[PDB]
Design a binder for this molecule. Structure first.
Ligand code: XZ2
Ligand code: XZ2
Ligand code: MG
Ligand code: MG
Ligand code: MG
Ligand code: MG
Ligand code: MG
Ligand code: MG
Ligand code: ZN
Ligand code: ZN
Lengths: 184, 368, 368, 184
DNA sequence: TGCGAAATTCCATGACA
DNA sequence: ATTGTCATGGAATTTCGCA
DNA sequence: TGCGAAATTCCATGACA
DNA sequence: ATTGTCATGGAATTTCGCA
């Protein structure tokens, strides 16, 4: 059986609703299974249409053999199925209520949620502008299990943005204060 | 003047005037019987005026000016006097064409890694498509991998927006561009400094310097044209298609596609290569590192038989960028301060500024 | 299809499939273990579709298309199938560039006599000068002697007016011009028939054919520019000056001025040649007739290493004159009816018309 | 002493007033002494200004060493003298009341007057348009004395307009009738 | 151990406003 | 302070299949 | 019957919208 | 049914002046 490779499988999911930012409410999260490389796309809704529009950008750079997702409405529509079929992409669903991916992907998704939460407090409305820096951060984060970052596994070179300060990701006393205040 | 010509008439030898000829007086003028006929020898003090009158009839070069003079006059080394005047006619210097070709092109090394160097440029204006008129084209130097962005104008602001999207993936060490307004603004300079990106600019009016991306612009337009044959030119929706198609097209000389050079493995696109199916990713990446270092690199071609290469101190003239109707194509002479490489120089320009300039936009000033 | 591939699996030799390789079945497909790896051998009836899919990804040429196919498939003589499809892709045929140069230029004989052949053309629009915007340039083929007329438009009517003035001196056998609107009108055709003058037209979009006058246009503009340096571009009053200056300028290769070639003696202009002062007019005219017949004539230069010359029956494509943005640069293929000379042909065009066309505006259709 | 040549001497004179034709009233006549070649220029007046304007056209094709004329006002002005001086042209005047040129020139001028008179009767107003054909006719007229036409002597070749019918130049019965009627 | 044909490599040509 | 490039399809050259 | 310098010829380069 | 051209200034080559 053949070793795992980039583009074998993309894991997709929505995060949100988030506070409005340049009119956007959600983030479509795409994580390559083998490398852990993350791509993020702002959408106004978790619809099939927003997903197709966002994945059309990604799939004009690289096409996965398989897309894995939960049974969200956007992903189980006959339109989304037609879209995947047109591109020779197999669709793969976790069973309802039992979301499952891989350790690496789960950990990566956890990182994404935590990094997002941390950077939105103080500026819950400015995340649109921060999405690039977030992805670079995620994609230049060292993998304990594999000896390499997603960038290194995807491109086979070091990056020009090493993120040397592997960070807290934890909310400080101040940030918990204003995060418990923002939900008042 | 008279001294020289006096000694001559009384048969004493003056250097430059061959002794075997008979120099006489007639009608108040010194004359000489030469093979082609009788000519007047004007006094030295008259010669510059004569050369100038002959030259000025039609601002002729060496031979055509000489031929006029030789109709009436003979004196020693006439061409030396003609050339002296050619070298001082401002009007000739700035209007005449060059007859020396530039020295052979450089083939700079392929950037060693993906993201070492981006080349960027605008294509357009194109027929309006969804309100868009231009394409930002971004080409990775090492790989050839290319990103396309539709824009409404070739502005800094649309460049920044597109590159914020692109640099989500990775930040390049260097971005090379021409001197389009989009790229030379202080807003774009700040945008790049903020990110640790070095901006590198082409010499002015020399698109060959952005050749990496210019050449991709050709393929982009060629494929768009093919896909639009017999349909209206709704190009906006084909950009993604063209981007993917070109990024997965083989270069016959390399035997790789840009996608392969960037990722070392094909994604799920038609006719995906499968040779490394049994390698681990690390083995694959290791083969990729090898493939990257041994790509064909072309070499500097032979000089043409009459090229010139610039020398520190040389007088040279810069081509006028957009010369008005009936105006000279060349600026006044200027001096080569520094030879950056055999094809690129700093000159002390037509005002008083340092300018870094392609040799293709220079001619060597004629007649020293 | 299946027949061929069936016989193959049971180990019987089919021409084209080398016997030394092991052909098997797997996953429902015929396969072969080849040096570069295992490939699928599709049935013959499937191959055209495959070639077409691979080609259509980015409308690639021979090698880049083959390289895609070879990723998954092997069959005998794949390139022959690729080329077959290349030769039928309309979109490729009309959009791709040529990679064959035209054959070496002809150097037609200098017209034997003054007034045998005029070459005429317009220069402009120029900056307005006394309400004038253009110059009619008339160049005598044998002599190079040139007449200049300022006009308000490049119209038939202004051409006729100027030529009525010029032909006061002499009527030419032939007037050669390009296909400017001024020259191709029925009014101009009548004007010339009325006078016994034959009109000869350049192939379309090929100014080299009017090279005699185009080359004079260069000298005219160059001298005007020089005389206007640092002054406003009031060119109207300099036309007479430029006309006289150029008509009395030596061609270094000929050693004569156009005036001399026309008249055999200089008029009262500066530096007038005086060599025939002691000849009678008849002796002078006799020397002139000799001078005229022995002028330098250049010869057809060497072909470039990859030129093509047209052959009756060949498929060739005419360049699109003013191609729209994102539209092909070439017309659909057409056939060479007649080879007028190695650089000029009649073709049966993209509608159904005969067209006489320069080889510089043609490419040979690729892939036969 | 050196043989006579084209451009040695131009003989100039005015003819007119003539009936208006495209606004023009006079013809400036220029005849090259050696060849007999004629050039004609329509003017609105026999002024220095019209002469300079007309000779500026001619002298942008060829410059004579000498211009010969009678003592007409146009030719004896200090302006016309300045013009000639600027171009290195010597001016030459016949003594008043004694016009003299050369046999060839006198004969040529006679031909010009006669040809003009003949062609204007019937169409006294259409001569402007006929000036080209008149010059070609004159310049391709065989010279009894020299064995050649002016065209042949000027260019050293035959012309493409030989004027084979060396013509009457005499006014017919009809033309005398309408020429004596036009001055009524 | 050499042949005829196919496959691969060479490379001039031309277009990137 | 920077610097040409590379798809294309015939032709030239090399390799392949077989003996 | 040869030398050094001048004169002449060669010719690639580039521009004629 | 038509077709490149030729001024330009360094370099290559020839000729000139003298012996
Ligand atoms: C036409 N100008 C305004 S420009 O200053 O010259 C200019 C400015 C730009 O920003 C460009 O992108 C381009 C150009 C010219 N050009 C076409 C071209 C021509 C010849 C070549 F060798 C190459 Cl490589 C490309 C460009 O693509
Ligand atoms: C630009 N066009 C409209 S055109 O059809 O080509 C056209 C039409 C005309 O009537 C012209 O006089 C000229 C042109 C183009 N051109 C400049 C040019 C370019 C390359 C050369 F080799 C030569 Cl020789 C001359 C002309 O002088
Ligand atoms: Mg979900
Ligand atoms: Mg640009
Ligand atoms: Mg460009
Ligand atoms: Mg024209
Ligand atoms: Mg022209
Ligand atoms: Mg008079
Ligand atoms: Zn000058
Ligand atoms: Zn195609």
């Amino acid at each position: 059986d053949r070793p795992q490779k980039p583009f074998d499988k993309f894991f997709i999911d929505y995060i949100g609703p988030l506070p409005p930012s340049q009119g956007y409410l959600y983030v479509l999260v795409v994580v390559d299974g083998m490398t852990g490389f993350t791509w993020l796309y702002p959408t106004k809704a978790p619809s099939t249409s927003a997903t197709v529009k966002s994945l059309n950008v990604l799939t004009s750079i690289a096409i996965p053999k398989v897309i894995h997702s939960d049974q969200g409405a956007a992903f189980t529509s006959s339109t989304f199925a037609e879209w995947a079929k047109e591109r020779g992409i197999h669709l793969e669903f976790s069973t309802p209520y039992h979301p499952q991916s891989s350790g690496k992907v789960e950990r990566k998704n956890s990182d994404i949620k935590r990094l997002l939460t941390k950077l939105l407090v103080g500026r819950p409305t400015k995340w649109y502008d921060l999405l690039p820096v977030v992805q670079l951060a995620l994609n230049n984060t060292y993998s304990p299990v594999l000896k390499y970052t997603p960038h290194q596994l995807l491109f086979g070179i070091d990056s020009n943005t090493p993120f040397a300060n592997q960070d807290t990701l934890d909310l400080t006393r101040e940030e918990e204060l204003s995060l418990l205040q923002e939900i008042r | 003047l008279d001294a020289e010509l006096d000694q001559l008439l009384q048969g004493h030898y003056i250097k430059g005037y061959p002794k075997q000829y008979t120099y006489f007086l007639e009608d108040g003028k010194v004359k000489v019987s030469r093979p082609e006929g009788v000519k007047i020898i004007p006094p030295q003090s008259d010669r510059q005026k004569i050369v100038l009158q002959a030259h000025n009839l039609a601002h002729t070069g060496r031979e055509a000016t000489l031929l006029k003079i030789a109709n009436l006059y003979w004196w020693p080394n006439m061409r030396k006097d003609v050339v002296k005047q050619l070298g001082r006619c401002q009007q000739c210097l700035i209007t005449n064409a060059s007859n020396k070709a530039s020295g052979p092109i450089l083939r700079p090394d392929r950037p060693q890694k993906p993201f070492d160097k981006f080349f960027i440029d605008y294509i357009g204006p194109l027929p309006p498509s969804q309100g868009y008129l231009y394409v930002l084209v971004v080409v990775d130097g090492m790989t050839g991998f290319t990103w396309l962005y539709p824009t409404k104008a070739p502005s800094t602001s649309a460049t920044v927006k597109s590159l914020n999207v692109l640099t989500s993936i990775a930040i390049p060490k260097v971005i090379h561009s021409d001197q389009g307004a989009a790229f030379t603004s202080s807003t774009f300079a700040e945008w790049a400094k903020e990110r640790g990106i070095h901006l590198e600019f082409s010499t002015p009016y020399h698109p060959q310097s952005s050749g990496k991306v210019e050449r991709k612009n050709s393929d982009i337009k060629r494929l768009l044209t093919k896909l639009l044959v017999g349909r209206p030119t709704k190009w906006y929706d084909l950009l993604p298609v063209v981007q993917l198609a070109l990024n997965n097209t083989y270069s016959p000389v390399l035997k790789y596609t840009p996608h392969q050079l960037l990722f070392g493995i094909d994604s799920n696109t038609p006719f995906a290569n499968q040779d490394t199916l049994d390698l681990t990713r690390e083995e694959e990446l290791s083969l990729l590192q090898e493939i990257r270092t041994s790509l064909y690199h072309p070499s500097t071609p032979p000089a043409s038989s009459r090229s010139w290469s610039p020398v520190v101190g040389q007088l040279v003239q810069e081509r006028v960028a957009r010369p008005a109707s009936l105006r000279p194509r060349w600026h006044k002479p200027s001096t080569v301060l520094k030879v950056l490489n055999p094809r690129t120089v700093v000159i002390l320009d037509h005002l008083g500024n340092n300018r870094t300039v392609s040799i293709d936009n220079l001619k060597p000033t004629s007649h020293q």
